Amino acid sequence: MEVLFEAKVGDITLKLAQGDITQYPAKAIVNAANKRLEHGGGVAYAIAKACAGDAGLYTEISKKAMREQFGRDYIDHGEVVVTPAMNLEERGIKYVFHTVGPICSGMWSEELKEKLYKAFLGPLEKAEEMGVESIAFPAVSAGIYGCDLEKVVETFLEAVKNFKGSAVKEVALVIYDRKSAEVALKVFERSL
Ligand SMILES: Nc1ncnc2c1ncn2[C@@H]1O[C@H](COP(=O)(O)OP(=O)(O)OC[C@H]2O[C@H](O)[C@H](O)[C@@H]2O)[C@@H](O)[C@H]1O
């Protein structure tokens, strides 16, 4: 895990790091899920495998959690399903907060931005509600959902800036590949 940037946004310490989110030292990590919480690939698969030892098992656990937390088999942008991090608890990660970003498919609009904005703010508000002090996020929608990485990072930063809370003290954005981390770093530098 390599930290590439650190700054304060109010009382929150914000970090950009390059690495695997399942190894980040945060109490909650966020999953870039689909609305059905079927963890087929990308960071959802990585998280599901790291937590349960089998992604399929974590998918079932997630669906059960969603059914009881929401009373249905899908979530809307901004809604957050919470599941225990299981095997990751030994490294201090207690929860996975599943969020669902929009499917951009190479496009960008205010409607897509608003959906992604909700997908980033929702987990921050859930952390606040639960009294969770540290949370880490992946670049929601920047993978197979095809949202431009720069736009994803700018949207994440807007959510962190607008968030109001007292319990959340540390937020991190964890980027996986080297090329992408460089793009994110430039966004952090020009935004702050
Ligand atoms: N271990 C990891 N740690 C941090 N980031 C990662 C990791 N693995 C991948 N990424 C980055 O995570 C970012 C997000 O890529 P994506 O995981 O496709 O998510 P989406 O929101 O676009 O697609 C959601 C759908 O994909 C799944 O199949 C779900 O079940 C959904 O069906 C990229 O920058 C990756 O390089």
**H/E stretch holding 45:** helix 42-52
- Within 6 Å (CB) of ligand 1, which residues are found? 20-22, 32-34, 38-44, 46, 101, 138-145, 174, 176-177, 180
Angle at 74 between CA 63 and CA 29, to 5 degrees: 65
| CATH value at residue 97 | 3.40.220.10
Q: How many CB atoms lie within 10 A of CB 155?
A: 26
Tokens of 177: 């590949």
CA dihedral 177, 178, 180, 185 (to 10 degrees): 130
Experimentally, the structure was elucidated by: X-ray
Q: What would the DSSP string read from start to end of 112-172? A: HHHHHHHHHHHHHHHHHHHT--EEEE--TTSSTT---HHHHHHHHHHHHHH---SS--EEE
Known binding residue 131? Answer is no
Quote the number of domains for the chain: 1
Q: Find the 9 Cα to ligand 1 centroid distance in Å.
A: 26
Angle at 132 between CA 112 and CA 19, to 5 degrees: 65
**H/E stretch holding 70:** helix 55-70
Atom of ligand 1 nearest to the CA of 152: 34
Which residue out of 144, 147, 182 has the highest number of ligand 1 atoms within 8 Å of its CB and is therefore the one to mutate? 144
48-54 long-range contacts (CB < 8 A, ≥24 apart) are 50/22, 50/87, 50/88, 51/22, 51/83, 51/84, 51/85, 51/86, 51/87, 51/88, 51/96, 52/86, 52/87, 53/87
Q: What is the resolution of this structure in A?
A: 1.5
Query: What's the one-letter identity of residue 117?
Result: Y
Domain extent at residue 48: 2-192
Beta-carbon contacts of residue 180 (< 8 Å; ≥ 6 apart)? 139, 142, 149
177: buried, middle or exposed (CB in 10 Å: 19+, 13-18, 0-12)?
exposed
Angle at 67 between CA 62 and CA 71, to 5 degrees: 155
CA dihedral 63, 68, 73, 78 (to 10 degrees): -90
